[PDB]
From a paper:
Semisynthetic derivatives of the bacterial natural product rifamycin (e.g., rifampicin or Rif) are components in the first-line treatment of tuberculosis and other gram-positive bacterial infections. Resistance to the rifamycin family of antibiotics commonly occurs in clinical isolates as a result of point mutations in the antibiotic’s target, the DNA-dependent RNA polymerase (RNAP). To study the inhibition of RNAP by Kang-like congeners, we solved X-ray co-crystal structures of Kang A in complex with both wild-type Mycobacterium smegmatis (Msm) RNAP and a RifR RNAP variant carrying the most commonly observed RifR mutation found in Mtb clinical isolates (Msm RNAP βS447L). Our structural analysis revealed that Kang A binds the same site on RNAP as Rif.
Residue numbers in the entry:
A (entry chain D): 1187 to 1188, 1202 to 1283
B (entry chain D): 726 to 902, 910 to 1010, 1027 to 1054
C (entry chain D): 331 to 593
D (entry chain D): 3 to 55, 86 to 132
E (entry chain F): 351 to 365, 368 to 466
F (entry chain C): 21 to 205, 215 to 232, 237 to 311, 323 to 1139
Write the structure that this text describes.
């Protein structure tokens, strides 16, 4: 968001339902209400949360699933290959 | 170690027969106060409970004075391996006051112990508190699991994304303003937001340090009381949080790795307890859900006289 | 089997909708009083409603025994709703379970695995190496060999199990330390030998307690098991930093008696 | 089978979308023949539309309604999506959709 | 008639506690990984035998059972491709089959019987 | 005692049992005999109570008779139920899979008022399932038990409540009938706050008669309605929203609702609840209102005009006076009533469209509903349960069990926690200690020992009445209500010459019930025995008074979990109930006539009585129980022995010499031993394996049928398409495994084949068929094989064939059942436990050579960790451990001059005792501490003069491994432990690949399908916490749901290649389709924004 606004305190149940991912909120609580509001708003899911990737079978964006870790390139040093 | 359990090893203290009668006699006199009528009936139970729940402590110390320090049952508890002194008191001595199904303490105590064996009525009365406690631990797991699930879902996407966000914001830990009871959970394992300064004066611990145990004592020596510390509350990281703000990983004992999913770790760290919570799970849910407090308390809207 | 038939409630729900749809067509073509046609249209609307979310509006459609039919909404929503019953949680291959027994002679990185359980779990692995060796000419011979528990397979199983980690888990899983990797040890009997130190992490007492075994397959899976989830690498509880594999009841009294000072 | 796609999007399925998806209109409330046990044509398991006895899990059908129908999710869901879109009291909208 | 009168039951029904019946039905045509691989290993073993046979002999055995095309072929239809009387194709088939039964060629496939 | 068998077991009790244990199976038989109206119950009621009794069937028949026409022209009357002798024996029904039943004829009649003709006839209702001598039903061959249900007693219940905000004392009351809507005070059946005045307007001087209450007049003043018809419209609009009232419909509205039998079933219990409180009658509804009025004032007495006064207070629904249990006889009666009511409707419609004079009792009656109601109840109802038969004690507590859930009772979810708690009125009626440990706590409980059920459905308790401070031998069974009306003296009370109290004051229970200490003049009744609160199972735990209710509850639940051992040795230290529980369970052979044995055979035993008449008893030998346990019986008498009526002839599975033997007596050492016994684990001597002491036989029943398919008929045959001759080497001609043959997992029991077509074989396969000359067979192999891990030998085979005139379901030709048994040596991981709630698995079994052993060289059988004993408050297990050693070693008090000061209360028979004597310590008056130490001081040398256990019950044990002794004296003794139905062989599961579900592509769980383990929601959280993305992906894609991924990984493992990259979980694809079916257009999108075909 950073047209004035005030800081808001909201519980976990209410804060989790307000996440930008619609299938995550659907898999949490009240699947029907989330789907109806998401279909109307024509929402789109970036598929960047970790529960989303779990549902579709992707690597979770955490631990060994982070890009900087999975795209590593492993080769022996020029010195090593020679010594054999 | 030659640690076994036997009938002999469970010894009843000999100061217990007199002690009850001493406290028993204090009950016929409050019966005089009830028979006199100067005090109400609920006050009769109250004065009865306070005197009876005192005798429990007297037989407690009485029991301990009699036991030899090498008694196998006491050795089990002394070592910290397993057991409670409350359980030992219920084994030999007296059970004490038990719960009524409605929840109020019975004025009548169970003078017998499971060593001497309870009677028909003494055993029956105890079933109320024994079953009611066994059903409390039955639905305790269902509410804790539902709480853990909401914790996980609200925090699952929180992971460390960068080594440092370079922010200078932080929070002040109390740190022994004698030592504070809980600096292990508040000051220990944090990273300094700013340099630790002594008057006027000397810098004893530089910022961006892990605050190990030796740091505390050294700090503690300098006469400092408070410290500004990095926290995920003030972390300015665009996505997730940074390693310096989160601090040490409790498992590795070192700076948190980059990929760590601390949101789930937190939801589980808070979720595993709650089976031990008995002022409990309701209050914890009220806080995280941010509901209007059960019994609202006012806060000052401005500083001044009252 | 038994020749009897079973089918989803959706078929009867679709059957209601298409029946009333066709009857409506029939009423229109004939030409029918507005009361009859309107009555049919209301019935049709209700069937589609029952098809989508049964019971959401008024009386739920029921079958025999008065049990309400399972609507499309009922596939997604409940604990049996896809997100809990299938999507996030689902049964897996290369897994097993059994009751656990104390493993006091084990190292912190080791776990006792019943030879029979370790056999079936690793069944393809032993099948492969036993065909490499000339024990079996083809795969079908290897599979027959393992199923009959031919004595030649035992020494082989040790070779395939060597330095191949396995994940151990006890329900309920409260924290991540509820799942830890171990090095399997072929042991006798049908019980699982568990290191007595990890009991604190698993909350496992040895009274009919059962634990599940999972076999990481891919190189990444085995790497994560040996590196991330190894037993001896996770000592401190990742909540307070305090040690969890720290000795408890039996070993505490033993060391207490050992170091205590007698006058 | 890519396994690496960017977005997942959801929206209201128009009659043409449903019309397009379907590999045929199921016309009869018949499941299978009672003697041959084979799927009945134009019915709910008709091989002509759904597939031969892996595609039987992929193909869909559609039913063409002789009268329009409101999706119960958008009418009865609270708050009433239709009720707020046309500014009709939900109790009023119930009287219209269901012929009261 | 009493078999016809049987009425169906619901898969979505539940049986003891929280377990719907539907989760217990096996998928019969689901590929079983232990057999499909052996089938691939089997068809490679047969590919070896064909190289031992005469080029015309190997071609006949396939077409007769349609290993490459996936469909059998009758003798007269195998005669058109080879331009020979269909009886000759039957003769070539008989001689090649007996040679396939010869001890050396079929020893491997015995174990692949089941 | 008081039993002919009379195995000598010395009792430590100090109070004689005034009343022998009533037949604890009476609860099941009495209720059923009331339903059928047997002559035994008929004469019992003539002797006591009603001059003419009422059979449960006759009671429901008096309700329907007569079925009167609307006009009344034709009236049909039912009467005179008739029962025919049973069709087949219980042993024959369990054999042929048929229900144990007796046909039921009735004597109906149809009278026409117009023509006055009389038409009598005989009507066959149907086969009426009967109750066995063991109190069970056989329904389609399975032995079933009907559990009594706890329900609210129909009637009125006032409950005081405190308003949430206003905190002013509010009073709501409900009237719960047997049928019809319920009224609450006038909110009627889910319509909030109808004016209280409109109800009497529905039915003058309303103010004058009730002028006492000031508030009742305030509500009336606020009521706007005036008149009877004008307000009956006000009450009409809310009962039927949308119907224009009729002048006639307004008046029939109120009377048809609650005051006629058609829509308001007058509760027989309900009619008795309100009559003592003050069909439905309008005057009674008024009497309910003023109690509400009178109870709001707080006045303690209300006098209904023309009726005796009663107290006006709030009712307790949990009080057993207002809470009844529907027993088995009534549970059948209610289902009979439902079947007769739907018959009433068909008879009514049948009358109209049928021609007058063309109808007879037969024409109007189709029984389909009646026998369907009986079949559905026994077949489906929650109350009809599969009898749990693992040990005779379990089957005895399955009967005598009362649970609140089920049809008509509180639901499993909505039941509050206040009802789960124990109640002061429960004492002596329902056991507070025995109840499930899981979510069903307080909902399920077993009947107390001495409890008895009332013909009205309320539990009664035996008491001995005491007057003028003297206890007479009169015994009065008093229900809970009457129990609150007296002062109940405690079971243990000082006893002197005739009946006089030895001590000054008495301990009693009041109407609270609350404990008190009062004068001897006040007491009116006294407890018969001290176990009145305890049930059968709970009363079998020695030193019960020394264990917490938690572990005691556990101990009671685990006794019914034991398994029958091949040896079946009785408990050395037990209680009194050991004997009676075994004989009353019904698994023991009892002689019903005093006589002498004529022949003794393992098959049967015959006894010749004084009458000269022969009785003969056939023995169950290796009968498979419903849970796989062995039901073998064995005779305990020799040829010429003389027996008395009621004596024990043969031992059951878990009995020895007449008393229940659920476990074995083992030598125990309570030292921790090198961590192998740690955290409740256990270590045993290998002797328990070699000597088969904890060995228990387990049997399993397999089944396969050959039916007529559409393509062809299934044939049980020995000819199998593609199999070696060796796998058939144990089959006979028909193709079934031969008797006595072994079975390894995967072996063939019954060879069965089914037609297969069209073949359309593989081109690669058809060639191999041509080479090796094996014709591709026309049929598919579907044979009965042994399940994975299961093993044993074949005991017997049952075969039902269509060719022979056997009865089979339509389409089924042949049925063959194979019974396989196996010996189960006590093994690592098996679950053992004692009677005190202590339990643990067998961590390790050590050779007898290296085991802590006494100076005798006598190795201990079992080693129990010390740390688990003190914390759990089950120290009663330490007591029976000391007494256990005393019993096996014997003793002689050897008084120096007289009984040492501890033995003042000890009976003389307990002074001396030889080795291996059995001991009895009833729960609440058993052995005590002083007596135990003294008995510990009196002990006998083993063989030589040496004594093996000291005065505090410890001995210096020698480490069998090193040889050097153990530093500190270790407590040893004999403890009675049980083998529990949780066994390793049944609980170990392993899976690499196997079948998959049809809808979802995941492996299907359970041992039935070789299933895999479930990786649930919490487990995914742990993996995500670890950050093991690949491990998590692997578990959710290629291990379960990737149709192509899981098959390629198998190919990779076999070829030894790298494991492939996972695909799309089938679960996700199914999710997309399920969303589409909801008219939700979901599109997977790439960076380009182009849709992607999911195929
Ligand atoms: C087919 C059948 O007979 O199953 C029975 C049941 C499993 C067998 O009788 C079983 C032998 C059992 O008696 C023994 C066994 C050792 O215990 C167990 O098996 C477990 C593992 C559960 C517990 C354990 O072993 O630890 C002994 C148990 C000892 C105790 C103190 C105990 O807990 N008792 C017990 C346990 C129950 O759970 C219920 C129960 C119930 C009602 C109305 C009850 O009164 C129950 C009850 O008193 O309502 C529920 C929701 O659902 C109803 C479910 C079933 O009822 C049938 C009735 C009809 O029969 C065929 O079609 C119907 C079928 C669909 O449902 C139940 C009543 C339900 O859970
Ligand atoms: N794929 C990770 C990469 C984060 C990183 O390594 O910086 C996100 O998204
Ligand atoms: Mg446990
Ligand atoms: Zn930061």
């Amino acid at each position: 968001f950073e047209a004035a606004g005030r800081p808001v305190l909201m519980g976990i149940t209410k804060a989790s339902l307000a996440t930008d991912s619609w299938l995550s909120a659907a898999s949490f609580q009240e699947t029907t209400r989330v789907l109806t509001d998401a279909a109307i708003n024509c929402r789109s899911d970036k598929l960047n949360g970790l529960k989303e990737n779990v549902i579709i079978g992707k690597l979770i964006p955490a631990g060994t699933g982070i890009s900087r870790y999975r795209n590593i390139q492993v080769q022996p040093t020029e010195e090593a290959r020679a010594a054999a | 170690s030659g640690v076994t359990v036997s009938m002999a090893d469970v010894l009843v203290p000999p100061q217990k027969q007199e002690i009850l009668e001493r406290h028993e006699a204090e009950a016929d006199a409050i019966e005089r106060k009830y028979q006199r009528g100067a005090l109400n009936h609920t006050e009769r139970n109250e004065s009865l409970v306070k005197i009876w729940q005192d005798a429990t402590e007297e037989v407690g110390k009485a029991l301990e004075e009699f036991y030899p320090a090498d008694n196998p049952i006491i050795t089990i508890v002394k070592s910290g391996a397993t057991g409670n002194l409350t359980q030992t008191r219920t084994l030999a001595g007296m059970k004490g006051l038990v719960t009524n199904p409605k929840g109020e303490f019975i004025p009548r105590p169970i003078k017998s112990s499971f060593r001497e064996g309870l009677t028909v009525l003494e055993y029956f009365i105890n079933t109320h508190g024994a079953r009611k406690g066994l059903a409390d631990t039955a639905l305790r797991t269902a509410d804790s699991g539902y709480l853990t699930r909401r914790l996980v879902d609200v925090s699952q996407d929180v992971i460390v994304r960068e080594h440092d966000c370079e922010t200078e914001r932080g929070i002040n830990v109390t740190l022994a303003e004698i030592r504070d009871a809980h600096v292990e959970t508040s000051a220990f394992a944090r990273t300094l937001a700013t340099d630790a300064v002594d008057a006027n004066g000397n810098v004893i611990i530089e910022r961006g340090h892990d605050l190990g145990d030796p740091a505390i004592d050294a700090l503690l020596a300098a006469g400092i009381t408070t410290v500004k510390v990095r926290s995920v509350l003030t972390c300015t990281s665009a996505t997730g949080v940074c390693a310096m703000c989160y601090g040490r990983s409790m498992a590795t004992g070192k700076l948190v790795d980059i990929g760590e999913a601390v949101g789930i770790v937190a939801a589980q760290s808070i979720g595993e307890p709650g089976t031990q919570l008995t002022g409990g799970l309701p209050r914890v849910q009220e806080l995280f859900e941010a509901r209007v407090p059960r019994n609202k308390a006012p806060i000052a809207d401005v500083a001044g006289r009252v | 089997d038994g020749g009897r038939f079973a089918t989803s409630d959706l078929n009867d729900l679709y059957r209601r909708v298409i029946n009333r749809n066709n009857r409506l067509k029939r009423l229109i073509d004939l030409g029918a009083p507005e009361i009859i046609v309107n009555n049919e249209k209301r019935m049709l609307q209700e069937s589609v409603d029952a098809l989508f979310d049964n019971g959401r509006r008024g009386r739920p459609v029921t079958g025999p025994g008065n049990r309400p039919l399972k609507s499309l909404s009922d596939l997604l929503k409940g604990k049996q709703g896809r997100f809990r019953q299938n999507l996030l949680g689902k049964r897996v291959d290369y897994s097993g379970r059994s009751v656990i027994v104390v493993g006091p002679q084990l190292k912190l990185h080791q776990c006792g695995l019943p030879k029979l359980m370790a056999l079936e779990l690793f069944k393809p692995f032993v099948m492969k190496r036993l065909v490499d060796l000339n024990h079996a000419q083809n795969i079908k011979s290897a599979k027959r060999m393992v199923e009959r528990q031919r004595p030649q397979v035992w020494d082989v199983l040790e070779e395939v199990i060597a330095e191949h980690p396995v994940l151990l888990n006890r329900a309920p899983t409260l924290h991540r330390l509820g799942i830890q990797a171990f090095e399997p040890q072929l042991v006798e009997g049908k019980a699982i030998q568990l290191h007595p130190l990890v009991c604190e992490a698993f909350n496992a007492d040895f009274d009919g307690d059962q634990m599940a075994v999972h076999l990481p397959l891919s190189a990444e899976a085995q790497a994560e098991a040996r590196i991330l989830m190894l037993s001896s690498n996770n000592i401190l509880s990742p909540a307070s930093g305090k040690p969890l594999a720290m000795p408890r009841l039996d070993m505490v009294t033993g060391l207490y008696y050992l170091t205590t000072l007698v006058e | 089978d890519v396994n690496f796609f960017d977005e997942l999007r959801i929206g209201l399925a128009t009659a043409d979308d449903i019309r397009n998806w379907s590999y045929g209109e199921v016309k009869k409330p018949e499941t299978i023949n009672y003697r041959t046990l084979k799927p009945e044509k134009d019915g709910l398991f008709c091989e002509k539309i759904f597939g031969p006895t892996k595609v039987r899990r992929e193909r869909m059908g559609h039913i063409e309604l002789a009268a329009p129908v409101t999706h119960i999710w958008y009418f009865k869901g609270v708050p009433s999506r239709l009720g707020y879109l046309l500014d009709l009291a939900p109790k009023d909208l119930e009287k219209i959709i269901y012929f009261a | 008639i009493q078999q016809y009168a049987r009425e169906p039951i619901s898969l979505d029904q539940t049986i003891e506690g929280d377990s719907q019946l539907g989760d217990f039905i096996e998928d019969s045509e689901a590929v079983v990984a232990v057999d499909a691989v052996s089938f691939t290993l089997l068809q490679d073993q047969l590919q070896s035998v064909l190289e031992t046979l005469s080029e015309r002999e190997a071609g006949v055995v396939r077409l007769r059972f349609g290993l490459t095309d996936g469909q059998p072929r009758t003798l007269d239809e195998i005669g058109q491709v080879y331009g020979v009387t269909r009886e000759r194709i039957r003769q070539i088939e008989s001689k090649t089959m007996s040679k396939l039964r010869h001890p050396s060629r079929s020893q491997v496939l015995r174990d692949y019987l089941d | 005692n008081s039993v002919p068998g009379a195995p000598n077991r010395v009792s430590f009790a100090k109070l004689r049992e005034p009343l022998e244990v009533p037949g604890l199976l009476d609860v099941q038989t009495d209720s059923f005999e009331w339903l059928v109206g047997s002559d035994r119950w008929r004469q019992a009621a003539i002797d006591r109570g009603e001059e003419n009794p009422v059979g449960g069937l006759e009671e429901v028949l008096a309700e329907l008779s007569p079925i009167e026409d609307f006009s009344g022209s034709m009236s049909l009357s039912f009467s005179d139920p008739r029962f025919d002798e049973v069709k087949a024996s219980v042993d024959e029904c369990k054999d042929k899979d048929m229900t144990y039943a007796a046909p039921l004829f009735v004597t109906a009649e149809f009278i026409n008022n117009n023509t006055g003709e009389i038409k009598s006839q005989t009507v066959f209702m149907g086969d009426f399932p009967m109750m066995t001598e063991k109190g069970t039903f056989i329904i389609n061959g399975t032995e079933r038990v009907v559990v009594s249900q706890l329900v609210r007693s129909p009637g009125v219940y006032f409950d005081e409540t405190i308003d949430k905000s206003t905190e002013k004392t509010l009073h709501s009351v409900k009237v719960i009938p047997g049928r019809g809507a319920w009224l609450e005070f006038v909110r009627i059946d889910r319509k909030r706050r109808q004016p209280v005045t409109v109800l009497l307007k529905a039915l003058e001087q309303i103010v004058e008669r009730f002028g006492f209450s000031e508030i009742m007049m305030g509500t009336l003043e606020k009521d706007t309605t005036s008149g009877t018809d004008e307000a009956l419209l006000d009450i009409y609009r809310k009962l039927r929203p949308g119907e224009p009232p009729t002048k006639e419909s307004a008046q029939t509205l109120l009377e048809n609702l609650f005051f006629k039998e058609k829509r308001y079933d007058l509760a027989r219990v309900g009619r008795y609840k309100v009559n003592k409180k003050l069909t439905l009658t309008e005057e009674d509804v008024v009497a309910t209102i003023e109690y509400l009025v009178r109870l709001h004032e707080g006045q303690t007495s209300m006098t209904v005009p023309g009726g005796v006064e009663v107290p006006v207070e709030v009712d307790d629904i949990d009080h057993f006076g207002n809470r009844r249990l529907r027993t088995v006889g009534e549970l059948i009666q209610n289902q009979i009533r439902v079947g007769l009511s739907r018959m009433e409707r068909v008879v009514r419609e049948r009358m109209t469209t049928q021609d007058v004079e063309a109808i007879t009792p037969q024409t109007l009656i189709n029984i389909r509903p009646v026998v369907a109601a009986i079949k559905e109840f026994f077949g489906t109802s929650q109350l009809s349960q599969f009898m749990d038969q693992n040990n005779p004690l379990s089957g005895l507590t399955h009967k005598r069990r009362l649970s609140a859930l089920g049809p008509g009772g509180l639901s499993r979810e909505r039941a509050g926690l206040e009802v789960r708690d124990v109640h002061p009125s429960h004492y002596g009626r329902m056991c507070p200690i025995e109840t499930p440990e899981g979510p069903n706590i307080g909902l399920i409980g077993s009947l107390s020992v001495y409890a008895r059920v009332n013909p009205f459905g309320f539990i009664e308790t035996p008491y001995r009445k005491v007057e003028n401070g003297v206890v007479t031998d009169q015994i009065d069974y008093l229900t809970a209500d009457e129990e609150d009306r007296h002062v109940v003296a405690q079971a243990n009370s000082p006893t002197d010459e005739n009946g006089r109290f030895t001590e000054d004051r008495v301990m009693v229970r009041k109407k609270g019930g609350e404990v008190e200490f009062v004068s001897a003049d006040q007491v009116d009744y006294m407890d018969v025995s001290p176990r009145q609160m305890v049930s059968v199972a709970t009363a079998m735990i020695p030193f019960l008074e020394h264990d917490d209710a938690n572990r005691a509850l556990m101990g009671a639940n685990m006794q019914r979990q034991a398994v029958p051992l091949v040896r079946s040795e009785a408990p050395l230290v037990g209680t009194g109930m050991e004997l009676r529980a075994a004989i009353d369970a019904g698994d023991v052979v009892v002689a019903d006539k005093t006589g002498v044995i004529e022949e003794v055979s393992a098959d049967y035993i015959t006894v010749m009585a004084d009458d000269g008449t022969r009785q003969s008893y056939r023995l169950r030998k290796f009968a498979r129980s419903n849970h796989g346990t062995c039901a073998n019986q064995r005779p305990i008498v020799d040829a010429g022995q003389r027996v008395e009526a009621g004596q024990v002839i043969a031992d059951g599975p878990c009995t020895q010499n007449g008393e229940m033997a659920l476990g074995k007596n083992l030598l125990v050492a309570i030292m921790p031993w090198e961590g192998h016994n740690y955290e409740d684990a256990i270590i045993l001597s290998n002797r328990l394996v070699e000597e088969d002491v904890l060995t228990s036989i387990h049997i399993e029943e397999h089944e396969i049928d050959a039916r007529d398919t559409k393509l062809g008929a299934e044939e049980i045959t020995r000819d199998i398409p593609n199999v070696s001759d060796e796998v058939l080497a144990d089959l006979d001609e028909r193709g079934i495994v031969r008797i006595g043959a072994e079975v390894r997992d995967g072996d063939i029991l019954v060879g069965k084949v089914t037609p297969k077509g069209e073949t359309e074989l593989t081109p690669e396969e058809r060639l191999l068929r041509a080479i090796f000359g094996e014709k591709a067979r026309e049929v598919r192999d579907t044979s009965l094989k042994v399940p994975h891990g299961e093993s044993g030998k074949v005991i017997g085979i049952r075969v039902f064939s269509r060719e022979d005139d056997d009865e089979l379901p339509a389409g089924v030709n042949e049925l063959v059942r194979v019974y396989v048994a196996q010996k189960r040596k006590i093994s690592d991981g098996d679950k053992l436990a004692g009677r005190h709630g202590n339990k643990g698995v067998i961590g390790k079994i050590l050779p007898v050579e290296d085991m802590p052993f006494l100076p005798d060289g006598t190795p201990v059988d079992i080693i129990l960790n010390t740390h688990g004993v003190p914390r759990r408050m089950n120290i009663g297990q330490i007591l029976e451990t000391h007494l256990g050693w005393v019993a096996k070693a014997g003793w002689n008090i050897d008084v120096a001059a007289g009984v040492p000061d501890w033995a003042s209360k000890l009976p003389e028979e307990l002074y001396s005792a030889p080795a291996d004597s059995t001991v009895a310590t009833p729960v609440f008056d058993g052995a005590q501490e002083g007596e135990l130490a003294g008995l510990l001081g009196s002990t006998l040398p083993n063989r030589d003069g040496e004594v093996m256990v000291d005065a505090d019950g410890k001995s210096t044990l020698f480490d069998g491994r090193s040889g050097e002794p153990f530093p500190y004296p270790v407590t040893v003794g004999y403890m009675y432990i049980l083998k529990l139905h949780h066994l390793v062989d049944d609980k170990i599961h392993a899976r690499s690949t196997g079948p998959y579900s049809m809808i979802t592509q995941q492996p299907l769980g359970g041992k039935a399908q070789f299933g895999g383990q479930r990786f649930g929601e919490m487990e995914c959280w742990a993996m995500q916490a670890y950050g093991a993305a690949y491990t998590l992906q692997e578990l959710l894609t290629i291990k379960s749901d990737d149709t192509v991924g899981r098959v390629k990984v198998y190919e990779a493992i076999v070829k030894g290649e790298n494991i492939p990259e996972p695909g799309i979980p089938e679960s996700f694809k199914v999710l997309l389709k399920e969303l589409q079916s909801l008219c939700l257009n979901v599109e997977v999108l790439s960076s380009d924004g182009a849709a992607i075909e999911m195929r």
